[PDB]
Structure 1
Amino acid sequence: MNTMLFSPYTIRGLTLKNRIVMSPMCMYSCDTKDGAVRTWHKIHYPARAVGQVGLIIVEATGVTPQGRISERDLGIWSDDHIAGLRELVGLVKEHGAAIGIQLAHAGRKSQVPGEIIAPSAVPFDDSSPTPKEMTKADIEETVQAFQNGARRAKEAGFDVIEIHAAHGYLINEFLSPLSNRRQDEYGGSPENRYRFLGEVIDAVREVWDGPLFVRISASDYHPDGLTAKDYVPYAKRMKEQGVDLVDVSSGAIVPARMNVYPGYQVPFAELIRREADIPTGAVGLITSGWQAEEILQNGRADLVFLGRELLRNPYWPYAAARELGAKISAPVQYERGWRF
């Protein structure tokens, strides 16, 4: 009757109505190819807000044109993006949800034409372009891009900011020795490989004091790569720097075979949560209320992130409530339909 899934959760004064989070998912719907919010986004995101999702994280938003995954990504490299993002924020919040945004940079995995950058001039695979080895100017420049992105998100009115340090993208590339072969202060050791992430966090915190999320790939799924245990010290530091919650994913630094199954990334979320003593978000094949409640009640994570399931059904929270025999507030307009 009284579940944890539909119990409020507060982060730095921001109270989420429940533990349900819409995981950041690229829509590749910027038809103008200028990183601008389009009509699609204005229908896509607010629909989940009506569905009673507590927190909606907007897809990976490129902090630079080269930082995009594709030419159809959302962008935040220009003050001109603020208006569209502000409109999106207004629409989502107006319908009851808190809204966040995922600041991102694809790095060597960018599919945008032209030069792409990485810690080292090593391609993702034999079929990918060789990225440019970033100079220290490029580094502080990219850090500034993240800070500016954060400032624009703040102006747009976002409630939450997430730093995308996962899925083998730019920050993840600095993190993993598989991609980071630098021999300056940005590579060659756990501390050095973390530096870039540390500087991004600090820069963001200069202009942003709201809830701050970091999304990581807890594992590289490679013998010579990173494991969940490597991220425990990193999470402790993130905590000291004022990161509020770790959004725990995994993989994609290089091509690799992964054993995918229900809750396959949950152990990573709990590892960091209990060892680094920091709130975590669980993601990866979470599709049922029954499943989500188990994750919460057993203290494996504090928030549950839903991906593809929210693509199949934007009103998932209602089905989850039914599933758990719980009752939640429905939009007044849908009360006749939302029966418990």
Structure 2
Amino acid sequence: ARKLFTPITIKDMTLKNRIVMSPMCMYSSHEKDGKLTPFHMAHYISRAIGQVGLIIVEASAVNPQGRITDQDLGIWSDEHIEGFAKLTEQVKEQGSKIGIQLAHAGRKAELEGDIFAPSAIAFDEQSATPVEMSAEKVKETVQEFKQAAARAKEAGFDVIEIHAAHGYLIHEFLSPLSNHRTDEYGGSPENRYRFLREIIDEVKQVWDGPLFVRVSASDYTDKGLDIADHIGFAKWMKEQGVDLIDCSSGALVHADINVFPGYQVSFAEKIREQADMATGAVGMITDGSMAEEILQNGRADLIFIGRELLRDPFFARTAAKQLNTEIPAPVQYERGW
């Protein structure tokens, strides 16, 4: 069978195909309490019916002030467990595996009141200046990722992904453009990586399953991080037990980015080869032919699909047809697929 529909096993978790629903914020928690709503249930479960191998739930805040907006999903309270337990059970029942992206928006948080970051530097001219986290606060945040991971495990998730990309809190600590700290969390690449290092180690104390980390492989800015920097971080993550690196890019600050089909694939290929780390490719991949080429030419291990899954929830079927192959259909739709 096509590589796109060939299984892969990661830490006891076996995915039936290589299609992954990339995490995408829905801004639909209208009660502003970070809880799930019927919309979220239908939104996610429908792609499970659609045969996506792994569905990654949108950025879920580990602290209420770490939300991007007050409509974001959260996982900062035990009260969030009940809802997530229902979602994981139903997604798995339809045949898919499910993961959750643990997040903290840092200086890009669009909330009232003080927002936090490694240094008091605003995202742009239209944003509020964040408050520099005290060492105590940085360590409490590490514990919040750990506590959130514990809740995710209890809720039944198969995979946990750490959001270290798109200019949010962890990415802010990683890049010299946003981190000007003078303590143990700033300076050398070792110190800039320390926040992520501690998060990974603490999460490992409560979670032994598949662990993914999403990164922005380049800042596309002078004096910022580039692929060489991320190959270095990737080697350190490998040593810590990270199973796969989800390769995105940009958004730390505004930058000129040449966007085209497969524009972020070179990052996934370089990290995979140089860091001997499994990688996820993402970025304007909209058909089965490109997905297959990426996998077959050894550029990545999983194909993350975002916007095409918003246009076509049953992308798996469409891709199978494009590749002239067959895949199992959800039982209820056998007479249509």
Residue aligned with 1:246, SS: strand
User: What corresponds to 1:332 in structure 2?
Assistant: 331
Measure the CA separation in 2 of the matches of 1:149 and 1:228.
30
2:52 corresponds to which letter in structure 1? V
TM-score, normalised relative to structure 2: 0.99
Measure the CA separation in 2 of the matches of 1:277 and 1:76.
32
1:54 corresponds to which letter in structure 2? G
User: What corresponds to 2:212 in structure 1?
Assistant: 213
User: What corresponds to 1:144 in structure 2?
Assistant: 143
Matched, 1:83 2:82: yes
Measure the CA separation in 1 of the matches of 2:204 and 2:106.
22
User: What corresponds to 1:248 in structure 2?
Assistant: 247
Deviates more, 1:58-67 or 1:253-262: 253-262
User: What corresponds to 2:94 in structure 1?
Assistant: 95
1:51 corresponds to which letter in structure 2? G
| Residue 156 of structure 1: how far off its partner (Å) | 0.3
2:198 corresponds to which letter in structure 1? E
| Residue 295 of structure 1: how far off its partner (Å) | 0.5
| Residue 130 of structure 1: how far off its partner (Å) | 0.5
Measure the CA separation in 2 of the matches of 1:241 and 1:290.
34
Measure the CA separation in 2 of the matches of 1:105 and 1:257.
25
Measure the CA separation in 2 of the matches of 1:76 and 1:8.
30
Measure the CA separation in 2 of the matches of 1:48 and 1:238.
30
| Residue 263 of structure 1: how far off its partner (Å) | 0.5
User: What corresponds to 1:42 in structure 2?
Assistant: 41
User: What corresponds to 1:305 in structure 2?
Assistant: 304
Aligned length: 337
| Residue 184 of structure 1: how far off its partner (Å) | 1.2
User: What corresponds to 2:232 in structure 1?
Assistant: 233
Matched, 1:159 2:138: no
Measure the CA separation in 2 of the matches of 1:186 and 1:271.
27
Aligned ranges for residues 19-34 of structure 1 at < 5 Å?
19-34=18-33
| Residue 318 of structure 1: how far off its partner (Å) | 0.2
Aligned ranges for residues 66-145 of structure 1 at < 5 Å?
66-145=65-144
Task: Render the CA deviation track for 1:94-149: whole Å, top value 9, x for unaligned.
Answer: 11100000000000000011110000000001111000001111101100110011
| Residue 185 of structure 1: how far off its partner (Å) | 1.3
TM-score, normalised relative to structure 1: 0.98
Task: Render the CA deviation track for 1:255-293: whole Å, top value 9, x for unaligned.
Answer: 112111101000000110000001000001111000100
User: What corresponds to 1:274 in structure 2?
Assistant: 273
1:271 corresponds to which letter in structure 2? K
Measure the CA separation in 1 of the matches of 2:147 and 2:63.
10
| Residue 91 of structure 1: how far off its partner (Å) | 1.4
Residue aligned with 1:115, SS: coil
Residue aligned with 2:153, SS: helix
User: What corresponds to 1:178 in structure 2?
Assistant: 177
Measure the CA separation in 1 of the matches of 2:136 and 2:184.
13
Residue aligned with 2:260, SS: coil
Percent identity of the aligned residues? 67
User: What corresponds to 1:199 in structure 2?
Assistant: 198
Measure the CA separation in 2 of the matches of 1:286 and 1:304.
8
Measure the CA separation in 2 of the matches of 1:40 and 1:249.
27
| Residue 22 of structure 1: how far off its partner (Å) | 0.2
Deviating above 6 A after TM superposition, structure 1's stretches of 4 or more consecutive aligned residues are none
Measure the CA separation in 2 of the matches of 1:335 and 1:229.
48
Measure the CA separation in 2 of the matches of 1:232 and 1:332.
43
2:103 corresponds to which letter in structure 1? A
User: What's the Cα RMSD here?
Assistant: 0.6
Residue aligned with 2:204, SS: helix
| Residue 335 of structure 1: how far off its partner (Å) | 1.6
Q: Flag structure 1 segments of 5+ consecutive residues without an equivalent.
A: none
Measure the CA separation in 1 of the matches of 2:111 and 2:58.
17
Measure the CA separation in 1 of the matches of 2:298 and 2:17.
15
| Residue 188 of structure 1: how far off its partner (Å) | 1.1
Residue aligned with 1:142, SS: helix
Q: Flag structure 2 segments of 5+ consecutive residues without an equivalent.
A: none
Measure the CA separation in 2 of the matches of 1:328 and 1:119.
47
User: What corresponds to 2:264 in structure 1?
Assistant: 265
Residue aligned with 2:4, SS: coil
